[PDB]
Structure formats: C-alpha cells, structure tokens
Copies of this chain bind each other. A is one copy, B any other.
Amino acid sequence: PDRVVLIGVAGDSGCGKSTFLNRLADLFGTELMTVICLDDYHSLDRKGRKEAGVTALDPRANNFDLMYEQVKALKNGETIMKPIYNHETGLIDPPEKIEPNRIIVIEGLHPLYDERVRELLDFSVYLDIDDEVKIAWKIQRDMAERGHSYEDVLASIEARRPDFKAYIEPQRGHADIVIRVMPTQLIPNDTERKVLRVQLIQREGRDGFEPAYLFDEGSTIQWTPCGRKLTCSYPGIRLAYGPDTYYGHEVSVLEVDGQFENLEEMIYVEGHLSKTDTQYYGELTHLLLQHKDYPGSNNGTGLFQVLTGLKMRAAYERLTSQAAPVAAS
C-alpha cells in the first residue's frame, strides 16, 4: 500500500512564513511533500468574523468537520477539492485540486485542536515562542531591510492573549515534540536579546518515537561542553536534559542555552547527544550549516528544528518500511 504519512505543525508564524517548514523542505524536498495551510478551512471570511465578533483563533471561525473529512480522504488516497482562503482580500476563493502525496504536512493554528484530526496524525510539532523573543526577532529583521513593522506585532501579541491561551496553547499537551524558545539564563542583564534558551520537550510512550537524550536516559543532567578540549567565549554554551511532567504526561526535556560561534562547537555538542536519529555523524551540523542565513541558525532554535525533522523522517521510515523523500541537487 502506497501509504500517506500525516504531519501536524502548530504555530503562530503564519502560513509559508516559518523557517521550520523551509528546513523540512530542505530535508524532504517539495516534490513528494505538499504543505496545507489550515487557514483554508475558515468557516467565516474576514467580514464574517467581524460580524460574529470573533478572531481567526476562535474555533467558531474554523470548519473542523470539513478539515477532518478532507484530511481523512487524503490519507485514504483520494483527491480533494479544498477551499483557498485569500489573505489579501479576506475572501474564500473557489476550491483547489490537491492529490495525495508521500508526506502531507498540515500547518496552522489548530492542527491539534480537534480530537478526530489528532488521531489521523502520525507526528506533530508545536512551536512555542516566548513573546519577548518573537518581538526581539521582529526588530532584528526590521533593522536589516528597513521595514519598521514591529509595533503591529506588539499590538497583535497583547490583544491575542485571551484567545491564544484559550484555544492555541493547550495543543502543546497533544504535541509529540514542543520546541520552546525563551530568553537566556546565562547573562544577568540581557539587553541584546540575542542569546536564546531552547527546550525540546519530547513526549514519552509514543510508539515509533524514541526521544533524544544526553548521557543517561531518564536521569537529570546539566552539562557545559566548554573546558579543556573546547574553548568558548562568554557566556558559552550549556545543555540540560531530564525527565519532567508536561500537561500531565511524562516527557523528556532536552535543552540548549547559548550560541554556537563555529563548527567545532556544533559538532562537539552533536557528537555527545544520543538517539538524535542522524544517519551519519555530523548530519545535524551539516544540515544546520546548509543555510546559515536562516534565523536560529547558530543556536538551539535551528538545532532542534533540524533534530525534529529527523524524528519525522524516522517516523515516516518506520510507517512505510521505505526511505523518506529527499531534496534534489
């Protein structure tokens, strides 16, 4: 059976605008993977939302019944006629023809919201970014190309909180992996807002998914690779691993704080991680340095985005007994 694998990606970065999906495209290519933006399943257009007094985050603005049916149909090998939500006009355009593929990624705000859709997913990721980090990034991006559109991100964050906490964040409890970004604990008065502390919160007991760990599985460790063999500059790099309870479930949290200045630092860290699901030594570093221009390229953000990708590849190859798709040259 030509099996269709389904991947869910929860996040607030907008459709086609996250670096994680670019990294997935680098890994799996674009020929045998199709990405579906879940804003296409809005039951209410922009005017309709205003009329109703609800935001896009509200479940009532979204059609989960149609979502379930068309995603179920795709996994069952059927072609679908899915709607297109135009973000510019704020209208719902005529359906698009989407055929099945080896991998189907559903991306958006509510991929893990409905019980029925959850059960169709084979792997899932929630990208949890701290408000302050999101804001600091927006200023750095604005600084580069002279955009100055960060005051609207601030407005958006504050006003979204109620609906974000109500309907978006609880999906973290159902995600296999949660990449959690937040400010550093290595620097006392962080003014630059550059150095990040990132957590890979991995769900236990999901058959066909072995969490990555450091040193000893199921025990708690704090590690600093800087020392005799590796020279870092202040504040350096610090890892942490340990078991924890997240949304009432057992998880295994792998954590990196700091910035990678160079190759040696990246490989030294990669080499000492366990069950990273790399197919050869140095694949994370190799994949991470593929596109150094991406944000998070020199810290835990990129590292864990890539690592998550490998865990999907593992899941795919387990379900199909076949090699996963790859990007061309």
A residues engaging B (CB < 8 A)? 215-230, 242-243, 250, 272
Contact = CB atoms under 8 A, between A and B. Distances in A.
Given A221-B222, A222-B221, A222-B222, A227 B242 contact: yes
Tallying the copies of this chain within the complex gives 2
B218 A227 contact: yes
B223 A218 contact: no
Contact of A219 (B218, B219, B227): B227
Contacts of A224: 219-221, 242
Contacts of A243: 227-228
B226 A219 contact: yes
A223 B241 CA distance: 10
A229 B242 CA distance: 12
A219 B272 CA distance: 11
A224 B227 CA distance: 21
Given A218-B228, A220-B223, 15 more contacts: A215-B215, A216-B223, A216-B225, A216-B272, A217-B228, A219-B225, A219-B229, A219-B230, A220-B224, A220-B226, A220-B227, A221-B222, A221-B224, A222-B223, A227-B242
13 contacts: A215-B215, A216-B272, A217-B229, A218-B227, A220-B224, A220-B226, A221-B223, A222-B222, A222-B223, A224-B242, A227-B242, A228-B243, A228-B250
Contacts of A218: 227-229
Task: Say whether chain A's binding surface is mostly helix, strand, loop, or mixed.
Answer: strand
Contacts of A221: 215, 221-224
A243 B250 CA distance: 34
Contacts of A219: 223-230
A243 B230 CA distance: 12
Nearest to A219: B227
Nearest to A218: B228
B228 A223 contact: no
A212 to B, nearest CB: 15
A217 B228 CA distance: 8
A223 B224 CA distance: 12
A210 to B, nearest CB: 14
A45 B218 CA distance: 60
Contacts of A272: 215-216
A227 B228 CA distance: 30
Contacts of A229: 217-219
Nearest to A215: B215
Nearest to A227: B219
Contacts of A222: 221-223
A18 B225 CA distance: 38
Contacts of A216: 223, 225, 272
A239 to B, nearest CB: 10
A226 B225 CA distance: 23
A214 to B, nearest CB: 8
Contacts of A250: 228
A285 B227 CA distance: 30
A46 B263 CA distance: 66
8 cross-chain pairs, A with B, having the tightest CB-CB distances, nearest first: A218-B228, A219-B227, A220-B224, A222-B222, A218-B227, A218-B229, A215-B215, A221-B223
